[PDB]
């Protein structure tokens, strides 16, 4: 078995290997990359996403989210308070202000220490989940707006044509902006490109051990767990590496820098935080290997998780027994 310790693997494809996206994902899996739940892909030196980032300041962040924490430093939830619209140029200035800017630090490990010590005492503002793309239309390789769609994959594998669309999302971050522990909708893959700015630190649980994280989360968030049998779908719970280690949960960590891709694999729980002002682009995708994960994915039906239009067909076709209850949660 390749990668039996489930380590995060880093890949350096050549420009020739960067042509065929599906083929490269399958290659990474042949080497055991998926066992970690997360892989890094460093693009060939010849590649670029676009020519420059000098002209992005007028993008609008219609609903910036203030991420307010509750709990203890290593075990907390966050809720999202909606703020007034602002441009990316305005958001960048805010991220760099004295109230929000990254503190002085020695290295990524010192900054990680500071994040886990102090995150709960601040409420950073995240420009998350903005439909759009920063890839140039002429970028032919690993262009996250030009990937094969999940609807087409399901149709190719299973023969059923379905409604729905699959487009990317932009994320504008600042120091301490946080992504809570989650797997993707329908335990899909994700791919994330860090276009510009400061790093993003990731934590990940191997897919084969995801239920260990779920059991800890039920223990640590006992009211939330009574409320919903899949409450991590709400994307609000944080647990620190120190707490994971104390509870024997297998995990790994890695820091993504500008110009790098990360892929999350089906049922790979992940969480993390941004180091400072940055911009990422991410999208879900599928492969043949996903279908079995999609069929088994948990679902939130309590009403909290509320998701895209396109998840309807995935549930309807892959999980017909669950469909009626899940759809009630949507309505
Ligand atoms: O970058 C973020 O805030 C969160 N991203 C992801 O969870 C992802 O790409 O799957
Ligand atoms: Mg602009
Ligand atoms: Ni994710
Ligand atoms: Zn729920």
UniProtKB/Swiss-Prot annotation:
Its EC number is 1.14.11.66. One of its GO terms (cellular component) is pericentric heterochromatin. Residues 136-302 form the JmjC domain. It catalyses: N(6),N(6),N(6)-trimethyl-L-lysyl(9)-[histone H3] + 2 2-oxoglutarate + 2 O2 = N(6)-methyl-L-lysyl(9)-[histone H3] + 2 formaldehyde + 2 succinate + 2 CO2. One of its GO terms (molecular function) is chromatin DNA binding. Fe cation binds at residues 182, 184, 270. Its cofactor is Fe(2+). The modification PolyADP-ribosyl glutamic acid is found at residues 16-17. Its main location: nucleus. Binds 1 Fe(2+) ion per subunit. Keywords: ADP-ribosylation, Chromatin regulator, Dioxygenase, Iron, Metal-binding, Nucleus, Oxidoreductase, Transcription, Transcription regulation, Ubl conjugation, Zinc. Zn(2+) binds at residues 228, 234, 300, 302. It is found in: Nucleus. GO terms for biological process: cellular response to ionizing radiation; chromatin remodeling; double-strand break repair via homologous recombination; inflammatory response; positive regulation of chromatin binding; positive regulation of double-strand break repair via nonhomologous end joining; regulation of gene expression; regulation of protein phosphorylation. Ubiquitinated via 'Lys-63'-linked ubiquitin chains. Deubiquitinated by USP14 with the help of TRIM14 leading to stabilization. Residues 8-50 form the JmjN domain. The keyword Nucleus applies. It comes from the Eukaryota. Belongs to the JHDM3 histone demethylase family. Histone demethylase that specifically demethylates 'Lys-9' of histone H3, thereby playing a central role in histone code. Does not demethylate histone H3 'Lys-4', H3 'Lys-27', H3 'Lys-36' nor H4 'Lys-20'. Demethylates both di- and trimethylated H3 'Lys-9' residue, while it has no activity on monomethylated residues. Demethylation of Lys residue generates formaldehyde and succinate. This is Lysine-specific demethylase 4D. It comes from Homo sapiens. The gene is KDM4D. The chain holds residues 11 to 341 of 523 of the full protein.
